[PDB]
Write a protein that binds this ligand. Structure first.
Ligand SMILES: [Cl-]
Ligand SMILES: [Cl-]
Lengths: 106, 106
């Protein structure tokens, strides 16, 4: 709305994560991948370190809940999961679990 | 060291800030500005919103401490400060204070 409000929104986004989707929208044009989601973060880590990350999803259940498994290669494989109202949410939850495990948050 | 250790370092950096200087170093070559510091974040915000940010620094004092002021244009100007063992640290502290103020953390 007002741009004191917009200024606060941008500042908060930067303080939280060092990026600002709001500023990006302001600056964006139609003329002319930080990685903010756990799934993206894990894809990047795997690319550098070389392990494979893949997801398996079950169809939406009768309560409209999605469930996914994530596999991150190793011996044995690290397998986690996520649930949620859409598949991408399941993926981010599952990837977050793997990132926390790999971070050795002992 | 070991790359279980390297994997944990990268994962932690991603979880914290959605970037990984460690991964960047691994991937970097000599062949071929998220914004992780408050000073950078504030420079970006000012660029989008249009206000001017500038710093004034005093010379290192007899205890080797630096002190800086930051000015962020408005009426009146927002003026904050930072102290530290080098000028860049002063700048980041001062910029953080301004970001927190602009974020309306009431
Ligand atoms: Cl992905
Ligand atoms: Cl700067």
């Amino acid at each position: 709305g007002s741009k004191a409000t917009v200024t606060a929104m941008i500042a908060r986004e930067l303080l939280y994560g060092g990026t600002s989707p709001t500023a990006e929208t302001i600056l964006k044009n139609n003329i002319s991948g930080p990685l903010t989601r756990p799934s993206e973060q894990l894809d990047y880590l795997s690319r550098v370190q070389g392990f494979q990350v893949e997801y398996k999803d079950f169809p939406k259940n009768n309560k409209n809940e999605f469930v996914s498994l994530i596999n991150c290669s190793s011996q044995p494989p690290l397998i986690s999961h996520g649930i949620g109202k859409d598949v991408e949410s399941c993926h981010d939850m599952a990837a977050l679990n793997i990132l926390k495990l790999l971070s050795e948050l002992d």
